[PDB]
């Protein structure tokens, strides 16, 4: 048997709209990540999707077919049990250009990524470029490029695109990144991809001793109709632990918290609660470490967690000292061009009074630029952000021709 453990690594799945990210996650894990009505009706990813799988290897078999996602080797001709390697998880991002901020939110949770490039579309499409640049900015450098949809192009065309992909990464941080051709739809060459994930997206070192911090990307009311009273539960908060660890019965707080009035002014009240349970996927645990998307059960009224109400928050231990800032100072750099537009325009300098979008951790917030200098801006936010360490990465977006466009990045200075 294989053990039941939490996932130990998060692999992002990024790329231009409809290039096959969600189908690829399904090919690997058997799970369709889209859970929302609107996603099903439109046939697109809107919210971050999530799926897990065990990975193992049949030691008697040849690679790549030796790599399996279930405890059997019968497919590669062996009656032996495969050796368990690890449990992995996927953060499935939307490709739509209007949803870049959601991709950025998910990128804060990634330990590595797969950039899916469709073989039957011109290269490089706008969000192929934009997601690639975002990975580079955020530092998600453990990348595999997957050439998807090879089932609907000639061998010659796939080879031509392969060479353009290699030329694209030439002279960049991604120069040595592998390209693995697959058909997500027909589940072709997925075993090579699993092998590639093992080789190129190793589980990173974790720091379990720093103060526990979880970035929140989901929150839920888990109470379903037809449930008996003693099975009702408090609100559940989902996210990824980026450092430290959490345990059942720990006193925690959600930051910034709830928007309230205090002394005639808007304020955020930290939400104090206790961990009632911990789950990854369909499995309960007594503690949670980095890796995977954890569901933290609390004693909160479910009306407070319902419908991703807490998306963008962080969770820490109750006694942790964490800056919650309405005004932030950013040491910034700008990209030279707007990479996500169909025509890559030059990026204009930041000016005072601009409204910018700031991605910090899993949060997305609009703010007004109150000061501009050569390398520093100050921004007054519409909602405060929890800043759990010095020099946290932020990504800066500007509204250009009706779309929010990534234009730069920086470090939040505290
Ligand atoms: N021929 C072919 N079609 C594929 C392949 N993979 C996905 N598709 C098709 O491409 C379409 C989009 O797939 P989907 O997985 O939803 O793409 P996505 O990149 O997740 N889209 P989004 O950016 O909105 O999340 C679907 O019709 C799907 O069946 C493939 O390998 N071959
Ligand atoms: N900590 C904790 N997490 C829970 C509990 N029940 C469900 N969850 C988690 O909360 C999230 C939402 O689960 P749920 O509302 O049941 O929806 P679902 O089962 O994922 N999908 P669907 O409702 O379509 O079947 C999941 O991550 C699930 O694992 C619980 O008692 N404790
Ligand atoms: Mg998708």
UniProtKB/Swiss-Prot annotation:
Q: Which residues bind Mg(2+) 1?
A: 22, 45
Which cofactors does it use? Mg(2+)
Kindly give the InterPro entries that the UniProt entry links to this protein: eIF2G, eIF2g_C, eIF2g_dom_2, eIF2g_GTP-bd, P-loop_NTPase, Small_GTP-bd, T_Tr_GTP-bd_dom, TIF2_gsu
Annotated effect of mutating residue 18 to A: Reduces GTP hydrolysis 8.5-fold. Completely aboloshes GTPase activity
- Tell me the CDD domains matching this sequence: eIF2_gamma, eIF2_gamma_II, eIF2_gamma_III
For Mg(2+) 2, which residues are the binding ones?
A: 18, 43
Which parts of this chain are annotated as the region G3? 92-95
Question: Segment G1: which positions?
Answer: 15-22
Q: Which GO terms describe its molecular function?
A: GTP binding; GTPase activity; metal ion binding; translation elongation factor activity; translation initiation factor activity; tRNA binding
Outcome of substituting residue 96 to A: Reduces GTP hydrolysis 17.5-fold. Completely aboloshes GTPase activity
Q: Which organism is it from?
A: Saccharolobus solfataricus (strain ATCC 35092 / DSM 1617 / JCM 11322 / P2)
- Complex and partners: Heterotrimer composed of an alpha, a beta and a gamma chain.
Q: What does the UniProt keyword field contain?
A: GTP-binding, Hydrolase, Initiation factor, Magnesium, Metal-binding, Nucleotide-binding, Protein biosynthesis, Zinc
Q: Which family does the similarity line name? A: Belongs to the TRAFAC class translation factor GTPase superfamily. Classic translation factor GTPase family. EIF2G subfamily.
> Which protein are we looking at?
Translation initiation factor 2 subunit gamma
Indicate whether Metal-binding appears among the record's keywords.
yes
Q: Which gene encodes it?
A: eif2g
Annotated region (G2), positions in chain? 43-47
Q: What does this protein do?
A: eIF-2 functions in the early steps of protein synthesis by forming a ternary complex with GTP and initiator tRNA.
Q: What class of enzyme is it?
A: hydrolase
What segment(s) does the record annotate as region G4? 148-151
User: Example GO biological process term?
Assistant: formation of translation preinitiation complex
Give the reaction(s) catalysed. Answer: GTP + H2O = GDP + phosphate + H(+)
Which segments constitute the tr-type G domain? Answer: 6-205
